[PDB]
Homo-oligomer: A and B are copies of this chain.
Amino acid sequence: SPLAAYEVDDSTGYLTSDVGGPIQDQTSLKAGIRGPTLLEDFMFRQKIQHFDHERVPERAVHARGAGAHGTFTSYADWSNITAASFLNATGKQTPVFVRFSTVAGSRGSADTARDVHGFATRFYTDEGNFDIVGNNIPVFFIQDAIQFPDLIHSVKPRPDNEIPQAAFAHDSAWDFFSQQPSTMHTLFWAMSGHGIPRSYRHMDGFGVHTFRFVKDDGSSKLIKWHFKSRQGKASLVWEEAQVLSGKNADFHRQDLWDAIESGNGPEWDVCVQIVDESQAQAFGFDLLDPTKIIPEEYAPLTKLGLLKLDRNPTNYFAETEQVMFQPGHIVRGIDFTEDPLLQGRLFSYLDTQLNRNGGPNFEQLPINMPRVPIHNNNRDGAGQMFIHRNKYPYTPNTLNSGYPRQANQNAGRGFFTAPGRTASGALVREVSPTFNDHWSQPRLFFNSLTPVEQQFLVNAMRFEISLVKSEEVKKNVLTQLNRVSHDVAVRVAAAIGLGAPDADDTYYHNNKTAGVSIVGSGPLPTIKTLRVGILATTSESSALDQAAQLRTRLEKDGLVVTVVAETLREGVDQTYSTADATGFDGVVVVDGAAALFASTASSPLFPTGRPLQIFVDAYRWGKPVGVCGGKSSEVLDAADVPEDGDGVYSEESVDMFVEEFEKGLATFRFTDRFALDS
């Protein structure tokens, strides 16, 4: 590890300059005690120059994100399908670093914005660094990389005033979507719960593009990468996500960090779909088109190995901010395809690192270094950290005995382009007509959602599109939505007071696919790390005792428990003033606290009606909620919460309450609380 060698320990010692001279740094050098500061104060200038130059350009996209270290372990020797060394043996472990992100917001923007999300994984393999630079949605908005600035300019804030930070809440974004129909598949995903995942740990990762697996014999197959969450899939509800974006802008980065610090590091099965070269157009669409998925019914997933994140960074800036991913970081055994979105990406990520790093030696940053020797004739450049011994860095040479040697298919384990690949035809700036069906798969995705999930998507569209000022853009939007689903266009049109255009059934169908729905993916497989808010009072010794009782039990089941009361003390984590339902996955009121709720209700220590509002919000947003200890009635009545409601608990027995409530936490959302269009 190059990271270990560069760890700097400041737990002891006297302050020094960056050249080891002991110094101070608290008072400027001045000509007399009330005098002007001196130019000769080097202590001052070196410290302030450093401060003045701390910042580097944020990423052009995916600026907001967070990372962690961990380990990938192969489940088998996969030699039969790829020459990739990291996959060549059962149990082979390779270090990883992952960064997760949103796409459109700047650094500092909230984690819980509605957006596409990044899931970028570096495997520090024994034959070079291999990056899979993925998203949590398996399809992308556009079909050619040259369009990327168009898409991004359209979704980022309007450039006269840099308003708004909400990617989908403005005219220009919808102008682009409605004029560029390829966008429809990703737009439907982004309008689903996949736009507001519950956490990084509760989403999947996709390579998006078709890639190749290449064997040592030169043969190739076509693959899609799928990183399948072992935590289960889960989303926020929209109103919850909007509150969260104010109450805790760092919600996802904090959820990740805390899960790793508690020993609950997240896991994914790294999987592929594998198909033959001859099936490039067999599935009703072109595998070069990054706006299409291969339905799992046509190509099942094969599990290749386990990805686990189990260590946090030491210095966020040095590790997370400076990690520089590239789809060009490929290894023997993997190759590209002619997907025009992937093709252009290869150029963009090598170039943009010059912008961020300010010089060409970015791969020498510890987080970017490989874990094998580097042998090449790259030299000089700003920020050169190596002292190269070889004074004849050219090929061919005799003066260094012909080293470094060329690597290729038959030497040195070289990378090699899949040798079956060809190209033929004119040199064209033309779109393949095989790419032209922009609507069937959006409809496939929509069909595969549950009824209340369909409602949530329609409601997201109603919310966002109602913020578009231009009537002409809104009509254009309905034109495209209607090519996917007339019912979607009708329902969305109703909220914005326009008429939907008449049904156009060209692309309509009733087909469905497995594995895309959040609401239909079933209870979570684990409730470890999920958050329980226990609403108590310092008024009643019995209330605090009840909360402590609940705590001990819930904690041994891996839940993160917060006891809330008017003021802090022994056993109480959070005041009502700072508490919010967005902080919890379930809320329990201890019945000793009934007085705070069954009330209007007033104190200089928190806002009027806060305790009840926490419970009310939690219910409205679908969470398991309950009252533990004796007389539920009054709290549930004060909240207008029905005691017979699914995911509403009322028990005197602490043990029965915990059992029932824990089943609620796995269910995670009670969707019968949300109204549906008739």
Flag if A40 contacts B346 (CB, 8 Å): yes
A605 within 8 A of B: no
* The one of B108, B336, B432 that contacts A33, using a Cβ cutoff of 8 Å: B432
Q: Mark A10-32, 1 if CB is under 8 A from B, else 0.
A: 11111111111111111111111
In the bound assembly, the distance between CA atoms of A16 and B332 in angstroms comes to 12
With a cutoff of 8 Å between Cβ atoms, the chain B residues found around residue A279 in the complex are: none
Question: In chain A between 303 and 341, which residues have their CB closer than 8 angstroms to a CB of chain B?
Answer: 312-322, 328-332, 336, 338, 340
CA distance A371 to B19 in the complex (A): 8
Please tell me if A640 contacts chain B, counting CB pairs below 8 Å: no
Do A383 and B408 contact each other (CB < 8 Å), given the known contacts A398-B175, A421-B426?
no
Partner of A48, one of B45, B347, B426: B347
Q: Which residues of B contact A354 (CB under 8 A)?
A: 49, 53, 354
Q: CB within 8 Å of B: which of A387-441?
A: 387-401, 403-408, 411-415, 417, 419-432, 434
Q: A21 is contacted by which of B16, B129, B152 (Cβ under 8 Å)?
A: B129
- A497 adjacent to chain B (CB < 8 Å): no
Q: Which listed residue (B17, B105, B396, B407) contacts A128, Cβ 8 A?
A: B17
Q: Is the pair B106, A107 in contact by a Cβ cutoff of 8 Å?
A: yes
Which of A54-62, A486-494, A561-569, A660-668 forms part of the interface with chain B?
A54-62
Stretch at the interface among A198-206, A239-247, A499-507: A239-247
Asked if A336 and B35 sit within 8 Å, CB to CB, the answer is: no
Q: Is A360 an interface residue (CB 8 A)?
A: yes
A320 CB contacts on chain B under 8 angstroms: 162
CB distance from A82 to the nearest CB of B (A): 15
Stretch in A89-97, A373-381, A541-549, A627-635 with 4+ CB within 8 Å of B: A373-381
Check A159 against B317 for contact (C-beta < 8 Å): yes
Cβ–Cβ contact B175 & A108, under 8 A: no
**Bound Cα distance from A313 to B110, whole angstroms:** 26
Tell me if A602 counts as interface (CB < 8 A to partner B): no
Main secondary structure of the interface of A (DSSP, over half): loop
- From 354 to 380 in chain A, residues with beta carbon under 8 angstroms from any chain B beta carbon are 354-361, 363-366, 368-380
A332 and B17 CA atoms in complex are apart in Å by 12
Q: For the complex, what is the distance from the CA of A424 to the CA of B153, rounded to whole Å? A: 37
User: Are A338's CB and B383's CB within 8 A?
Assistant: no
| A26 CA / B405 CA spacing, docked (Å) | 11
Is A511 positioned at the interface, with any CB of B under 8 Å from its CB?
no
Closest to A280 in B: B34
Contacts of A411 in B (CB 8 A): 14
> Cβ of B365 and Cβ of A385 under 8 Å apart?
yes
**A644-659 interface (Cβ within 8 A of B):** none
In the bound complex, residues from chain B placing their C-beta under 8 Å from that of A22 are 127-128, 332, 407, 412-415
B398 close to A179 (CB less than 8 A):
yes
- A283 interfacial contact with B, CB 8 Å: no
Check A78 for interface membership: any CB of B closer than 8 A.
no
Interchain CB contact under 8 A, B36 and A40:
yes
At the interface, yes or no: A76 with Cβ under 8 Å from chain B? no
Q: Which listed residue (B47, B159, B429) contacts A146, Cβ 8 A?
A: B47
| A595 contacts chain B at the CB level, 8 A cutoff | no
Which residue of chain B lies nearest to A375 when distances are taken between CB atoms in the complex? Answer: B13
Which residue on B lies nearest to A395, using beta carbons? B150
Q: Which 10 A-B pairs have the closest CB atoms?
A: A246-B246, A21-B128, A106-B108, A14-B412, A32-B425, A20-B370, A108-B109, A22-B407, A53-B360, A10-B390
A-B contact pairs, 13 of them (CB 8 A): A9-B390, A16-B375, A16-B404, A24-B429, A26-B395, A29-B427, A35-B338, A36-B338, A52-B360, A54-B360, A163-B253, A421-B426, A421-B427
